[PDB]
């Protein structure tokens, strides 16, 4: 199942395939098959983000 994580930092997408998010927001992890870049989903849409920008503690 897709798991939820919370953002530790702001991240603003630079490429079209990246997700934008803000500190404290929830992200759904859709695909963590890659170690450093995960596909997620939030209220803004979907896209890739750095795995080290989030935590499993909600």
């Amino acid at each position: 199942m897709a798991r939820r994580v919370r953002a530790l930092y702001d991240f603003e997408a630079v490429e079209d395939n990246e997700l934008t998010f803000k500190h404290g927001e929830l992200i759904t992890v859709l695909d963590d098959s890659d170690a450093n870049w995960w596909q997620g989903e939030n209220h803004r849409g979907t896209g890739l983000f750095p795995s080290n920008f989030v935590t499993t503690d909600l």
Binding site: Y9, D10, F11, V14, E15, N17, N36, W37, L48, P50, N52, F53
Partner: peptide
């Protein structure tokens, strides 16, 4: 903020 590296996406 942690450093980001896009070379490896």
């Amino acid at each position: 903020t942690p450093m980001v590296n896009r070379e490896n996406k």
